[PDB]
């Protein structure tokens, strides 16, 4: 389906599968599995855009791509 590469400042590159129409929250749950960072403390970026957890990757323009590169930041929420 779709392969997601998640790069971060702290950990090795993460790889896992995703669906472009699922919420970004589903990505964060994969990150939580690999890093144990709770979903509420993660921020994901596509390019330089911060993704909102309720939105889908498709809504940010992920259409035909077979592989995408995301950035993870660990952030204490307000």
Residue numbers in the entry: 4 to 81
Q: What wording appears in the published article?
A:
To improve the long-term stability of the wild-type (WT) human FAT10 protein, we replaced the four cysteines in FAT10 with Ser, Thr, or Leu depending on whether they were predicted by bioinformatics analysis to be solvent-exposed or buried (C7T and C9T in the N-domain; C134L and C162S in the C-domain). For further structural studies, we designed a Cys-free FAT10 construct lacking the N-terminal four residues (ΔN FAT10; amino acids 5–165) and Cys-free constructs of the individual N- and C-terminal domains (amino acids 5–86 and amino acids 85–165, respectively; hereafter referred to as N- and C-domain). The N-domain crystallized readily and we solved its structure at 1.95 Å resolution by molecular replacement. We could resolve three virtually identical protein chains in the asymmetric unit that superimposed with a backbone root mean square deviation (r.m.s.d.) of 0.66 ± 0.01 Å for amino acids 8–81. Only the N- and C-terminal residues (amino acids 6–7 and 82–84, respectively) display distinct conformations and increased B factors showing that these residues are disordered and not part of the UBL fold. Of note, the side chains of residues 7 and 9 that are cysteines in the native human FAT10 sequence are indeed solvent exposed and only residue 9 is part of the UBL fold. As in Ub, the core of the UBL fold is stabilized by a dense hydrophobic interaction network that is almost void of aromatic residues. Overall, comparison of the FAT10 N-domain structure with Ub showed that not only the structured regions are well-conserved, but also the lengths of the loops except for the α2–β5 loop that contains two additional residues in the N-domain. Interestingly, the hydrophobic patch in Ub (L8, I44, and V70) that is used for most Ub–protein interactions, is neither conserved in the FAT10 N-domain (E15, L51, and K79) nor in the C-domain (S95, T133, and A159). To compare the FAT10 N- and C-domains in more detail and to identify conserved regions, we generated a multiple sequence alignment of FAT10 proteins. This revealed a conserved surface in the FAT10 N-domain that mainly consisted of the β5 strand.
FAT10 is the only UBL modifier to directly target proteins for proteasomal degradation independently of Ub attachment. At the very C-terminus FAT10 carries a di-Gly motif that is a hallmark for the covalent attachment of Ub family modifiers to substrates through a conserved enzyme cascade. To characterize the structures of the FAT10 domains in more detail, we crystallized the N-domain and solved the solution NMR structure of the C-domain, since we could not obtain crystals of the latter. Both domains adopt the typical ββαββαβ β-grasp UBL fold.
